[PDB]
Design an enzyme around this catalytic site. Sequence first.
Site, PDB file in Angstrom:
ATOM      1  N   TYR A  16      73.460 -63.966  43.018  1.00 60.76           N
ATOM      2  CA  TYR A  16      72.824 -64.438  44.358  1.00 60.76           C
ATOM      3  C   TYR A  16      72.010 -63.422  45.136  1.00 60.76           C
ATOM      4  CZ  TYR A  16      72.305 -66.474  48.909  1.00 60.76           C
ATOM      5  OH  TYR A  16      71.894 -66.644  50.485  1.00 60.76           O
ATOM      6  N   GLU A  33      65.337 -67.424  49.324  1.00 63.91           N
ATOM      7  CA  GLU A  33      66.508 -67.311  48.624  1.00 63.91           C
ATOM      8  C   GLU A  33      66.529 -67.651  47.379  1.00 63.91           C
ATOM      9  OE1 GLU A  33      69.709 -70.320  49.537  1.00 63.91           O
ATOM     10  OE2 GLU A  33      71.195 -69.178  50.059  1.00 63.91           O
TER      11      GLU A  33
END
Lengths: 303, 393
Positions: free
Chosen positions: B116, B204
């Site tokens: 991530y 993101e």
Amino acid sequence: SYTASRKHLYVDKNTKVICQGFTGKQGTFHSQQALEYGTNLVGGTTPGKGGKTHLGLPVFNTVKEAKEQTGATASVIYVPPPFAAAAINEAIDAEVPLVVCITEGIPQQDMVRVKHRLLRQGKTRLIGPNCPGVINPGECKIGIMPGHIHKKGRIGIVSRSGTLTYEAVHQTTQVGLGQSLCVGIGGDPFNGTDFTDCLEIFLNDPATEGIILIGEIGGNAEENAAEFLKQHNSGPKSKPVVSFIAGLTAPPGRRMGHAGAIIAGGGAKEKITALQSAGVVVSMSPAQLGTTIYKEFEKRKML
Amino acid sequence: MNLQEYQSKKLMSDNGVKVQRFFVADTANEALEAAKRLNAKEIVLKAQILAGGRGKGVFSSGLKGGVHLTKDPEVVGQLAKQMIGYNLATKQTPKEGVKVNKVMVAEALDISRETYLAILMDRSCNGPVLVGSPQGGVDIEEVAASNPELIFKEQIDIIEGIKDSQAQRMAENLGFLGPLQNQAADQIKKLYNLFLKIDATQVEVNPFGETPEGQVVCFDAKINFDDNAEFRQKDIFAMDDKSENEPIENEAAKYDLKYIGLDGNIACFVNGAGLAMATCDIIFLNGGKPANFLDLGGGVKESQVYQAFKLLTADPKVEAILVNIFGGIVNCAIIANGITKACRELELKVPLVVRLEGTNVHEAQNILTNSGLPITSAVDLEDAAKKAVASVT
Ligand SMILES: Nc1nc2c(ncn2[C@@H]2O[C@H](COP(=O)(O)OP(=O)(O)O)[C@@H](O)[C@H]2O)c(=O)[nH]1
Ligand SMILES: [Mg+2]
């Protein structure tokens, strides 16, 4: 450090104020209301028009030109958002003690740069952007708030919202408590003054006996302020504190990303109980702030 | 402002960030037809909504999963027909879900490991921050909660920018070893540049992928843009389809009137987000349910009040309007007339409550009483709430 400039938040009738964006439509308006209220506005600035007279006061090209030539100690900004971030740096370059930026809509990236150097100097204290301003009832009025609801009193107000701030001010005047100093920190996430800075002034101000904090859902500003009072406003000289959080009925927003949650771990129940744990009376009704702080004085026999 | 994945993916493609080559299909059959134009072993299909958790979502058609993959293009369209039109309900969206319209058909790439990564402006860090975890994927929030110490934060200095050592350390903390540590570190720097170039509050990529063939790819793109930066991000803000939200919301935006809807019969109208929320709050305290609210901020213009009432009343679910203007620049005795004129050149068949307070309000409400229209003024906030709730019987 930057915390040193906290003291400049507490304006009085000796503060000599100037207006950036003086000839602008808003700068012209609220400058009138500032002079009518009795604020010591000594001039303003508008690039390319330095030397003219506006509202009977001088107009300069730059802030330093306006500062040293008028001894100004506070500057209010109405520059449009695209160039508002620059107007703040000019005041800091001029080492203006207090800078109050009313402009809303400044790109966050710009304010990240402003706040970057702002925290590296202790001469200039910033309020905002996207805030109503600061007002010492009866003495000094720097901002857009309506001055005809302010009575010099015993309650210090710090608000994150905008027009909602006027409710607490109006309500505290009716019950007879008035206000010692009202400060709006604004809504933008990167600003020059937070709750703690104003709580530091209110707790250290003898004229401030009661406190009202007006927040709303979002972020963690309300929790941070709660932990401060838990440390500095507990024990003997515990000044009463009241608060109301708007949006506890608002719906949950539509998310797009895991980042927000990972950083939080936020609104309503969280801020409320957290604020309460610090010993603050959270008014559920937005219309019952004055009635609440009042009885908190009666409960402690302070009237 | 959030953009679809495919819209963000191109921004990333044109700025040195590598991502799967894709095709946008408006119809259901054109999803498989595009799967052929692409021509690749394994294909990946993604529903385009301004929300996350698509993989673990559920369509109103009973389809389990907002993202799927296969090697048969015929299967692509098979799943596309039962995706377009239906509402995908992820844990980020309300229970109702989000109507899907477009579908992304990209060249699926094998995944050897998921990490991530996110760049964003954080108030606590006073600027940009690198946020990553070596164990990414759709279960990032669970890993972040149970294992908070797998979340690596690296604050970035806005003046100096992304340092090579910062990017190199982040890549290392994400477990990118060997030559990949240099590749991932470079992609981190290219993401931070695109982050600042587009005035994004959040960028993101989940999962920040690592293919078995030794490539670092961004498989997901969730960008949140800064609305205040629109004046310098024209091309970026022109991409917003604006058709996902109700056509009345963006129409309200034609006049700089921030509008959001609710489920009620009282149509609020306030000059301040915080105050407008408190308005909806105290109404709830009095048994009423606000249908919505219009936010003006501080500026007051006759053209806005004429339209304002039009938008709120255009909502057939409205049974009353609540005006609460406390701090307008204009002597609101002026907008008080704008309320009588906005109502006369529109009539409206619903009551109307007004609460004004500012520059000489004594004369302002005099125009309302002697107007002859269903206007009921209120003194304070709690007063306007009770009256609004009572007028819907
Ligand atoms: N093996 C493989 N898995 C993929 C690929 N694309 C997506 N996935 C899987 O799909 C999951 C969800 O993907 P995505 O839509 O980007 O994330 P979301 O934000 O949770 O919807 C990922 O966690 C992967 O497990 C791919 O190209 N190859
Ligand atoms: Mg994802």
